[PDB]
Enzyme design. Structure first.
Site, PDB file in Angstrom:
ATOM      1  CD1 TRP A   2      -3.102  -1.692   0.566  1.00 59.38           C
ATOM      2  CD2 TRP A   2      -1.387  -2.283   2.142  1.00 59.38           C
ATOM      3  NE1 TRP A   2      -3.430  -2.931   0.809  1.00 59.38           N
ATOM      4  CE2 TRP A   2      -2.441  -3.298   2.051  1.00 59.38           C
ATOM      5  CE3 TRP A   2      -0.780  -2.603   3.378  1.00 59.38           C
ATOM      6  CZ2 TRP A   2      -2.716  -4.607   2.758  1.00 59.38           C
ATOM      7  CZ3 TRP A   2      -0.710  -3.943   3.996  1.00 59.38           C
ATOM      8  CH2 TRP A   2      -1.744  -4.945   3.762  1.00 59.38           C
ATOM      9  CG  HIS A   3       4.436   1.623   1.013  1.00 51.23           C
ATOM     10  ND1 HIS A   3       5.670   1.182   1.745  1.00 51.23           N
ATOM     11  CD2 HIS A   3       3.381   1.385   1.998  1.00 51.23           C
ATOM     12  CE1 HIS A   3       5.257   0.934   2.995  1.00 51.23           C
ATOM     13  NE2 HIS A   3       4.469   1.074   3.012  1.00 51.23           N
ATOM     14  CE1 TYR A   4      -2.776   3.984  -2.736  1.00 56.20           C
ATOM     15  CE2 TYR A   4      -2.291   1.633  -2.072  1.00 56.20           C
ATOM     16  CZ  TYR A   4      -2.915   2.685  -1.967  1.00 56.20           C
ATOM     17  OH  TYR A   4      -4.031   2.853  -1.159  1.00 56.20           O
TER      18      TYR A   4
END
Ligand SMILES: Cc1cc2nc3c(=O)[nH]c(=O)nc-3n(C[C@H](O)[C@H](O)[C@H](O)COP(=O)(O)OP(=O)(O)OC[C@H]3O[C@@H](n4cnc5c(N)ncnc54)[C@H](O)[C@@H]3O)c2cc1C
Ligand SMILES: CC(=O)N[C@@H]1[C@@H](O)[C@H](O)[C@@H](CO)O[C@H]1O
Ligand SMILES: CC(=O)N[C@@H]1[C@@H](O)[C@H](O)[C@@H](CO)O[C@H]1O
Ligand SMILES: *[C@@H]1O[C@H](CO)[C@@H](O)[C@H](O)[C@H]1NC(C)=O
Ligand SMILES: *[C@@H]1O[C@H](CO)[C@@H](O)[C@H](O)[C@H]1NC(C)=O
Ligand SMILES: *[C@@H]1O[C@H](CO)[C@@H](O)[C@H](O)[C@H]1NC(C)=O
Ligand SMILES: *[C@@H]1O[C@H](CO)[C@@H](O)[C@H](O)[C@H]1NC(C)=O
Ligand code: NA
Ligand code: NA
Ligand code: NA
Length: 483
Positions: free
Chosen positions: A423-425
Site C-alpha cells: 500500500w505504498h503506491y
C-alpha cells in the site's frame, strides 16, 4: 464528532466561500488544513465518514479487519485491484490511510529530503510537530520484535541503530501511531490545533471536479453528498490569493484532475470530458512498491516496531501482523519491500462516477532489475530465518517453514508467488511533471496538489510520516509566502 466544525450539511458548507478548499481529509490533508486555518478560512471535503467511535479504527489489534469488509461506496477501506491482478485498498474516511494502516512511523532519509529540495529546518520542525501529537516510542519490544531485531543484527543487517525516527542503513526500532494502550492516533487528530472559527470539515462529500473561471484559474469545486445531491462551493475571490489544494491521495488526485478536464486530451475525449488543459503526464509514471514474504498463522497480534534497512537502502525488511478472522486469528509475515523500483505504469479513468476507482497498472517487475532486487531481499529473509534468534523464538510461527539460503531459484519463486502491495503506491501528479516544487499544477492558477500522488519515490521505509509532515510543511510555506 469530537470537533464542532465537523459537519454533514453540504448545503450550508457550500453556501459559504473559503480562502482554501482542501480536497481529501487524509494524511496530508488534515495537517495542511489545520495549519492554514490558523490564519485563513478553510473547507476540507472528505468523501468518507468519521474515524471516531469505530473500534475497527481505534484498536491497533483490529488492524486489517476493515480490509475484509469493504463495500462499493461507504466502507472506510475501498478495495481495488490493479490491472496487473494485484489486490489492494485505499482509505475512505477522515484521517485517510492513517485510519486503516499498520501504524508504522519512520522518517525520510536526508538524501530523500535533499533530492526533494525541501527546506531541512522546516522538514525537521514539521516532523516534530506531527510526532508530538501522533507518534509514540515503544516502551517495550514484543517477543516477536525482539527476535526479529536480534535476528536482523545476527544476519548482518548492520549497523544496529537502536530506536530512532531516522532513515539509517541497518536495523532499528521505530515509532508507531499506536500508543501504549494499543489505541490509534489518526491524522484527523492533527485537526486539534485548527482554528475552529476558520475551518469546516464536511464529511460524505465526494469531490467530482475542480471548477475554473470563464491560464485556467481554479475557482472552486463540485462535490456529491451521500444523498445524490451535487453542490458547487467557491474560493473567496507575490502571494497567490485563495486556492484549491488536492490531497485526495495517489489514486484520488490524478482521478480528480482527469474528471476536471486536466489530463491527456485523447483520454478525456474518450470519456466526453471537456478539455480544460492538455497535461499528458497526469496519471503517468505511477508506481507501487512490491513485497515478497513468508507468512504463518498466529493467535497473537504484534504491532510493527522493527525495520531492517539493507545495504544501499535497497530493501526494507519488516515483520507485520494483520487480522484475518475473528482470541482472533492473525497472519504474521516477514516481508522484503523493494525500496526504489524502476517499474512504472499509469492511472486512467474507468468511468465518470467520482466514487469509483480509477484503473491503475503498476507493471510490477517489468524491469528485471526490480525482480533481481526482490531476490536480493528474499536472500536476507532466508538468512534471518536461519539465525539462532529466529530459531529459538517462541513467538515465531516459522519453525515449520525454512527457505534454503543457497537456492536462488526457490527465492525467485517466492518473489513470483507472494507478489503483493504494501500500500505504498504513489505518483500521478509528480513534482517536475504535473506540479512544480511549490506543488502548483503546471499551466493552472490557484490549484495545488500535496499528497502521495506527487512522489517519484516512496519516502522512508513507510510513507505516512513524510506525508503528514508534507501537509504541515506546505501549510507553513503557504502561510509564509503571505509576507
Ligand atoms: C492497509 C494500509 C496499510 C499501510 N501501512 C502503513 C504503515 O504501517 N506505515 C506507513 O507509513 N504507511 C502505511 N500506509 C501508507 C500510508 O497510510 C499512505 O501512504 C498515506 O496515508 C497516503 O496519504 P495521502 O494524504 O496521500 O492519502 P490518504 O491518506 O489516502 O488521504 C486521501 C484522502 O482523500 C479522500 N478522498 C479521495 N478522493 C476524494 C474525493 N474525490 N473527494 C473527497 N475526498 C476524497 C480519501 O477518502 C482519503 O481520506 C498504509 C496504507 C494502507 C492502505
Ligand atoms: C470567508 C472569508 O474567508 N472571507 C475573507 C475576508 O475575511 C477577507 O477580509 C477577504 C480579504 O481578501 O478575503 C475573504
Ligand atoms: C491459502 C494459503 O495458505 N495460501 C495462499 C495461496 O494458495 C495463494 O496462491 C495466494 C494468493 O494470494 O495466497 C496464499
Ligand atoms: C455494488 O456493486 C454490486 C455489483 O457491481 C451490486 O450488487 C451492488 O448493488 C452495488 N451497489 C451498492 C450501492 O451497493
Ligand atoms: C453517506 O450518506 C449516505 C446517505 O445518508 C449513507 O447511506 C452513506 O453510508 C454515507 N457514507 C458515509 C461514508 O458515511
Ligand atoms: C493469510 O495468510 C495465508 C497464508 O499465506 C494466505 O493464504 C491468506 O490470504 C492470508 N489472509 C489474509 C486475509 O491476508
Ligand atoms: C473464523 O470466523 C469466526 C468468527 O467470524 C471465528 O470464530 C472462527 O474461529 C473462524 N472459522 C474458521 C475456521 O474460519
Ligand atoms: Na549496512
Ligand atoms: Na529497483
Ligand atoms: Na528515504
Amino acid at each position: 464528532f469530537p470537533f464542532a466544525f465537523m459537519t454533514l450539511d453540504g448545503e450550508r458548507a457550500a453556501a459559504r466561500r473559503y480562502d482554501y478548499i482542501v480536497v481529501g481529509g487524509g494524511a496530508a490533508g488534515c495537517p495542511l488544513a489545520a495549519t492554514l486555518s490558523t490564519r485563513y478560512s478553510v473547507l476540507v471535503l472528505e468523501r468518507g465518514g468519521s474515524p471516531y467511535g469505530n473500534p475497527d479504527i481505534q484498536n491497533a489489534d483490529a488492524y486489517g479487519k476493515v480490509l475484509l469488509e469493504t463495500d462499493n461506496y461507504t466502507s472506510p477501506a475501498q478495495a481495488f485491484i490493479s490491472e496487473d491482478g494485484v489486490s489492494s485498498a485505499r482509505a475512505r474516511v477522515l484521517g485517510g490511510g492513517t485510519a486503516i494502516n499498520a501504524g508504522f512511523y519512520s522518517r525520510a532519509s536526508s538524501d530523500y529530503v535533499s533530492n526533494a529540495g525541501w527546506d531541512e529546518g522546516l522538514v525537521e520542525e514539521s516532523y516534530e510537530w506531527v510526532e508530538k501529537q501522533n507518534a509514540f516510542k515503544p516502551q517495550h519490544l514484543s517477543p516477536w520484535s525482539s527476535a526479529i531485531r536480534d535476528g536482523l543484527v545476527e544476519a548482518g543487517v548492520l549497523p544496529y541503530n537502536g530506536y530512532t525516527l531516522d532513515h539509517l542503513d541497518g536495523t532499528k526500532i521505530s515509532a508507531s501511531i499506536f500508543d501504549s494502550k494499543g489505541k490509534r492516533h489518526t491524522a484527523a487528530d492533527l485537526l486539534k490545533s485548527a482554528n475552529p472559527d476558520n475551518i469546516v470539515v464536511l464529511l460524505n462529500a465526494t469531490v467530482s471536479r475542480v471548477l475554473f473561471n470563464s491560464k485556467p484559474r481554479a475557482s472552486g469545486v463540485e462535490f456529491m453528498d451521500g444523498h445524490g445531491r451535487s453542490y458547487q462551493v467557491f474560493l473567496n475571490e507575490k502571494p497567490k490569493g485563495p486556492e484549491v489544494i488536492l490531497t485526495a491521495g495517489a489514486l484520488g488526485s490524478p482521478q480528480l484532475l482527469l474528471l476536471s478536464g486536466i489530463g491527456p486530451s485523447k483520454h478525456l475525449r474518450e470519456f466526453n470530458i471537456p478539455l480544460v488543459l492538455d497535461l499528458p503526464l497526469v496519471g503517468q509514471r505511477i508506481q507501487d512498491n512490491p513485497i515478497a514474504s513468508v507468512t504463518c498463522k498466529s493467535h497473537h497480534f504484534y504491532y510493527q516496531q522493527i525495520v531492517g534497512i539493507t545495504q544501499f537502502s535497497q530493501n526494507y525488511i519488516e515483520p507485520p501482523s494483520i487480522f484475518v478472522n475473528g482470541r482472533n486469528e492473525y497472519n504474521i509475515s516477514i516481508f522484503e519491500k523493494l525500496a526504489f523500483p524502476l517499474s512504472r505504469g499509469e492511472l486512467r479513468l474507468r468511468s465518470r462516477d467520482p466514487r469509483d476507482n480509477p484503473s491503475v497498472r503498476y507493471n510490477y517487475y517489468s524491469h528485471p532489475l526490480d525482480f533481481e532486487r526482490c531476490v536480493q531481499g528474499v536472500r536476507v529473509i532466508a538468512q534471518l530465518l536461519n539465525t539462532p534468534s529466529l530459531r529459538r523464538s517462541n513467538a515465531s510461527c516459522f519453525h515449520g517453514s525454512p527457505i534454503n539460503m543457497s537456492d536462488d531459484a526457490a527465492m525467485a519463486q517466492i518473489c513470483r508467488d507472494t507478489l503483493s502491495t504494501v500500500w505504498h503506491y504513489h505518483g500521478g501528479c509528480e513534482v517536475g511533471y504535473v506540479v512544480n516544487e511549490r506543488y502548483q499544477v503546471n499551466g493552472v492558477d490557484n490549484l495545488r496538489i500535496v499528497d502521495g500522488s506527487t512522489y517519484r519515490d516512496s519516502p522512508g521505509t513507510n510513507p505516512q510520516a513524510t506525508t503528514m509532515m508534507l501537509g504541515r510543511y506546505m501549510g507553513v510555506k503557504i502561510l509564509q509566502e503571505q509576507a
